[PDB]
Amino acid sequence: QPRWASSAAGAASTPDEKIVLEFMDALTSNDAAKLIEYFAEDTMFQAMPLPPAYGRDAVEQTLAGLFTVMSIDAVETFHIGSSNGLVYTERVDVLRALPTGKSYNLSILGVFQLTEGKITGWRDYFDLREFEEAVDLPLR
Amino acid sequence: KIEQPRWASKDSAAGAASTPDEKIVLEFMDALTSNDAAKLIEYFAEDTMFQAMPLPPAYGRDAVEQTLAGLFTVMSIDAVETFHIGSSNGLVYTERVDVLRALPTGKSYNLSILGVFQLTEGKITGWRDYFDLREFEEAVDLPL
Ligand SMILES: NCCC1(c2ccccc2)COC1
Ligand SMILES: NCCC1(c2ccccc2)COC1
Ligand code: NA
Ligand code: NA
Ligand code: NA
Numbered sequence: 001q002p003r004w005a006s007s008a009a010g011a012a013s014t015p016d017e018k019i020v021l022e023f024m025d026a027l028t029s030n031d032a033a034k035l036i037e038y039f040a041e042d043t044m045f046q047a048m049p050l051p052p053a054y055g056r057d058a059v060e061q062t063l064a065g066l067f068t069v070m071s072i073d074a075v076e077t078f079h080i081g082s083s084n085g086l087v088y089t090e091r092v093d094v095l096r097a098l099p100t101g102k103s104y105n106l107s108i109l110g111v112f113q114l115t116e117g118k119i120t121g122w123r124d125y126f127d128l129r130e131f132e133e134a135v136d137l138p139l140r
Numbered sequence: 141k142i143e144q145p146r147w148a149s150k151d152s153a154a155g156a157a158s159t160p161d162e163k164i165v166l167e168f169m170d171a172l173t174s175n176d177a178a179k180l181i182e183y184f185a186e187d188t189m190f191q192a193m194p195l196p197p198a199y200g201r202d203a204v205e206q207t208l209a210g211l212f213t214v215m216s217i218d219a220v221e222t223f224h225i226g227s228s229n230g231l232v233y234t235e236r237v238d239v240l241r242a243l244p245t246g247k248s249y250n251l252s253i254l255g256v257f258q259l260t261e262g263k264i265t266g267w268r269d270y271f272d273l274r275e276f277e278e279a280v281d282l283p284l
Binding site for chain 2: 006009011044046049054079081082083084085086088107108111113121123125126127129
C-alpha cells in the first residue's frame with residue numbers, strides 16, 4: 001500500500017469508472033474469451049512496453065498469449081478518475097509467472113476509453129524489466 | 141511536433157485543460173523543457189513526492205529538487221506532447237510523449253508516458269510518471 005495514496009480518489013464515481021472496476025475484477029479470471037466481451041468492435045489494447053493490438057480479434061489473441069505464462073492474481077486500485085470519456089487507474093497488479101511460481105506487485109497507471117459502456121481503448125503504462133527480473137522471466 | 145497516435149481520442153475536450161489544476165499541470169509540462177530543477181520546484185508543496193516509477197521515489201521538497209536536478213544532468217526534455225489530460229478528486233492525469241535526449245550519448249527518444257499529479261491548493265503534492273525505462277535506455281545507449 002503506497003505511501004503516496006491520496007478520499008474519494010479511490011472510489012469509482014460514474015458508470016464508466018464502475019465498469020472499469022468491474023473489468024479489473026474480471027481480469028483475475030485469466031480468461032481472454034470472457035474478457036473480450038468488455039471491448040467494443042472499434043477497440044485497441046496496449047501494454048505499453050509491447051506492441052499494440054487493434055480490433056477485438058487481435059486484442060483477444062494478445063491477452064490469451066499473456067495469460068499462457070502469467071496469472072493476474074489480484075488488482076488493487078489506489079486511484080480512479082475520469083474526464084472526457086477516458087478513465088484513469090493508478091493500481092498494482094499482482095502478477096504471478098506461471099513457469100517460475102514467482103509473484104510481483106507491478107505498479108501500473110492505465111487509461112481506458114469507453115463508448116456506450118464498452119472499452120474502445122486500454123493502455124497500461126509500467127516498467128517491464130522490473131517485472132521480468134522479479135519473476136525470472138523475460139517477456140519481450 | 142509529434143505524430144498523433146492512432147488511439148488518440150478525437151473528442152477535443154480530452155486533450156484540453158478544463159480545470160485550474162489541469163491548467164497548472166499543462167504549464168508545468170511546458171516548464172519541464174527549461175531543464176531547471178529550481179524553476180520546477182516552485183510548483184511543489186513542502187509535503188510532496190516525486191517518482192519516475194522505474195526508479196526510487198523522493199519524498200519532501202528538498203529530495204525532489206535534488207532528484208530533478210540529478211535527472212537534468214543526464215537528460216534533457218526537449219519537448220512534451222500531451223494527448224490526453226483529465227482529473228478527478230484532486231488528481232490530474234496526463235497521457236503524453238516526452239522527447240528525451242540523453243546528454244552523455246547525444247541520442248533522443250520519444251518516450252510514451254502516463255503521469256499522475258496530486259494537487260492541494262494549487263501546489264504539487266505528488267508527481268509519478270509511468271513508462272518503460274529499458275526501451276529508453278536501449279534507444280539512447282545509456283544504461284540507467
Ligand atoms: N497491462 C496490460 C497487461 C496486463 C496483463 C494482461 C493480460 C494478461 C497478463 C497481464 C495487465 O497488467 C499486466
Ligand atoms: N518520467 C519522469 C521523469 C522525466 C524527467 C523529469 C525530470 C528530469 C528528467 C526526466 C519525465 O519524463 C522523464
Ligand atoms: Na475517484
Ligand atoms: Na473529471
Ligand atoms: Na481533457
